Amino acid sequence: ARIRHVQGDITEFQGDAIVNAANNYLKLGAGVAGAILRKGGPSIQEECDRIGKIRVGEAAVTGAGNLPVRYVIHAAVLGDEPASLETVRKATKSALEKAVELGLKTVAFTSWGAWVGGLPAEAVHRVMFEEIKKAPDTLEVTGVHGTEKSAEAYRRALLEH
């Protein structure tokens, strides 16, 4: 799938879905998840509770409440097991699979930086980008970054070569 990198708040993404990095228990806390629970509203955690625990490396879909997407795809990168490059690979793949199953066209991810601090940053990026590349061209993926400097740096890396 094609990727485009922009600066923004992922909770303001106007497309079909956002991916929320998650624990496998599917319980929301602070950060992106906190913005989701506040701006999305109570229905998101309520539906996560309905789904129940999933395995690390899996994903699960909820509605998005008052957010301007249709779905939140929760990607379980850690929880009852630690994050690894394999859990990152699996969770990314699983999230993309849910998007494809739902027949979606536009899906946003963050860098997942706040979930992978003990892993090598460049390898995390490589694993995620490889999974996104393998996804069908029926998907357009947006990488949402906190700053313009970072968004542009990610675009720059796609020239290289």
The 3-state secondary structure of 31-96 reads CHHHHHHHHHCCHHHHHHHHHCCCCCCCEEEEECCCCCCCEEEEEEEECCCCCCHHHHHHHHHHHH
Cβ partners under 8 Å of residue 86, min gap 6: 57
- Take residue 32 and report the two structure tokens written for it: 């992106």
Cα 70 from Cα 61, distance rounded (Å): 10
Question: How many structural domains is the chain composed of?
Answer: 1
This entry's atomic model was obtained through: X-ray
Cβ atoms of 53 and 24 within 8 Å: the answer is: yes
Per the structure, the complete domain to which residue 77 belongs is given by 1-161
- Closest-CA residue to 4 (of 100, 144, 159, 128): 144
| Percent of the chain as helix, strand, coil, to the nearest 5 | 40, 20, 35
The sign of the torsion formed by the CA atoms of 37, 43, 49, 55 equals negative
Cα 3 from Cα 76, distance rounded (Å): 21
Under DSSP, the state recorded for 15 is S
Cβ atoms of 66 and 12 within 8 Å: the answer is: no
Cα 101 from Cα 50, distance rounded (Å): 20
First to last CA, the chain: 19
φ/ψ of 105, rounded to 5, equals -115, -35
φ/ψ of 22, rounded to 5, equals -145, 160
Cα 42 from Cα 45, distance rounded (Å): 6
* Long-range CB pairs of 7-12, under 8 A, 24+ apart, other chains included: 7/144, 7/145, 7/146, 7/147, 7/148, 7/150, 7/151, 8/144, 8/145, 9/35, 9/144, 10/108, 10/109, 10/110, 10/144, 11/35, 11/36, 11/39, 11/40, 11/67, 12/68
- Take residue 117 and report the two structure tokens written for it: 């601090």
CATH of the domain at 23: 3.40.220.10
